[PDB]
């Protein structure tokens, strides 16, 4: 049930029943951590961190190996993102379509898509304000959005 | 309709159903060990890889991402794990 799409897809990940690390995995809980630290220093998002470990190093779930999530581990070391990843990507998309809308005055659909994107931004901003992740004075402005990201 | 036991499904039934519509969810993917030519060091590669995997020793292109299962290079040898 997508918010702006009538169709309801079912494509998603299915976690296995077992939570124990496989025997063939030769990496330790400590050794995974600096790999996360090294890749984060390179400038990769935490969602991208898991994909690299999954594809190449055979780490199916970092939470099962180290006992902590990627964001929690990075927060402890101090490599914390300034803004939440999900909110940051939507702001980046809003800037890109807004820049495109300057040079195409007749693009009606681009105007409509911008409404949907900013609606999702306000919904996540209100939720992120409640969890005290964002200060209770942060606002999304079109001119400020370029400087934000 | 045909009579099926919801508690005890048949061997061909559970492997045929969708991964989310089974009694207990179970993925259809797996991990495999690949051996590239040029150097016979073993690399662990996910089946539905989304990035090109390079051998650590010799930097040879192992697999190319596709829509579904990743396609392996010619001459490579692979084995399912676990």
């Amino acid at each position: 049930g997508r918010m702006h799409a009538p169709g309801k897809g079912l494509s998603q990940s299915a976690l296995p029943y077992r939570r124990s690390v496989p025997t063939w995995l030769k990496l330790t809980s400590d050794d995974v951590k600096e790999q996360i630290y090294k890749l984060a220093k390179k400038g990769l998002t935490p969602s991208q961190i898991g994909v690299i470990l999954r594809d190449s190093h055979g780490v199916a779930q970092v939470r099962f190996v180290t006992g902590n999530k990627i964001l929690r581990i990075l927060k402890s070391k101090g490599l914390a993102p300034d803004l939440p990843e999900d909110l940051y990507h939507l702001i980046k998309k809003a800037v890109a379509v807004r820049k495109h809308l300057e040079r195409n005055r007749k693009d009606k659909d681009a105007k409509f898509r911008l409404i949907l994107i900013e609606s999702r931004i306000h919904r996540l901003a209100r939720y992120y304000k409640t969890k005290r992740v964002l200060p209770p004075n942060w606002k999304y402005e079109s001119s400020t959005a370029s400087a934000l990201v | 309709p045909l009579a099926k036991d919801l508690l005890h499904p048949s061997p061909e039934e559970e492997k045929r159903k969708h991964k989310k519509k089974r009694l207990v969810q179970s993925p259809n993917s797996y991990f495999m060990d690949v051996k590239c030519p040029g150097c016979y060091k073993i690399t662990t590669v996910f089946s539905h890889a989304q990035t090109v995997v390079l051998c650590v020793g010799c930097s040879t292109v192992l697999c190319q991402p596709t829509g579904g299962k990743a396609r392996l290079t010619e001459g490579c040898s692979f084995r399912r794990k676990q």
Partner: peptide
């Protein structure tokens, strides 16, 4: 195949995502 990844390195390698990426940039 290697060339196609290198074109995608610009999008997937960010320069202002983390908080540390701002503070060492301000120096």
């Amino acid at each position: 195949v290697l060339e196609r990844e290198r074109r995608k390195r610009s999008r997937k390698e960010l320069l202002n995502f983390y908080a540390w990426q701002h503070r060492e940039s301000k120096m």
